[PDB]
């Protein structure tokens, strides 16, 4: 689709069999979801945002369907204010910015 | 133009007689600029994201040119690690997400 930006670019994703809402976020290197259970191994990681740094759990090679488009890649889980889909999965679904 | 997301979508902006690089950020409601001594009245504000909140100065009706596309609106100035172009200006330059 083409998504304009007068509203937050919020979409439904499916991850670990569950539906969630997430913000399409070109300003994020990575995909960071609020606290949730994901299957498999994780490793501790630290990431930075506008307010400083946080600790996250890193899950690799997680399938995520985003607005009907398939991605499989890294998902970080920790205390983010909103679920964000970052460039690591945006690129997989063929997302560009156009103006 | 069309901006792919392999890399951070950094573009040249002009604000307050300065040329800067800034991140096109569909995840940001607001535009937040690195500390800079803009003239004009301002009002204090707090904005948050990953890592919590930073204190910023809100300036209204600031002309900002983004890749040659003119815009004018609110810019927040404070200790952000990076200049961020949020949806308030991205909508003025006609910016969309496409996949």
């Amino acid at each position: 689709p083409q998504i304009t930006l007068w509203k937050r670019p919020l979409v439904t994703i499916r991850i670990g069999g569950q539906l969630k809402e997430a913000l399409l976020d070109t300003g994020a290197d990575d995909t960071v979801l609020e606290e949730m259970n994901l299957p498999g191994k994780w490793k501790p990681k630290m990431i930075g945002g506008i307010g400083g740094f946080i600790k996250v759990r890193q899950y690799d090679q997680i399938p995520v369907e985003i607005c009907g488009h398939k991605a499989i890649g890294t998902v970080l889980v920790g205390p983010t204010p909103v679920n964000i889909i970052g460039r690591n999965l945006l690129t997989q679904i063929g997302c560009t910015l156009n103006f | 133009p069309q901006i792919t997301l392999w890399k951070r979508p950094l573009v040249t902006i002009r604000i307050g007689g300065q040329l800067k690089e800034a991140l096109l950020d569909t995840g940001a409601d607001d535009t937040v600029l690195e500390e800079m001594n803009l003239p004009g009245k301002w009002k204090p504000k707090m904005i948050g994201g990953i890592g919590g909140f930073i204190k910023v100065r809100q300036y209204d009706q600031i002309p900002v040119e983004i890749c040659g596309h003119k815009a004018i609106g609110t810019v927040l100035v404070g200790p952000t690690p990076v200049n961020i172009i949020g949806r308030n200006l991205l909508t003025q330059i006609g910016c969309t997400l496409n996949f």
């Binding site: 976020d25 930075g48 506008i50 | 940001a28 994201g49 690690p81 961020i84």
Partner: peptide
Amino acid sequence: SQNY
């Protein structure tokens, strides 16, 4: 790493 960096997420705005």
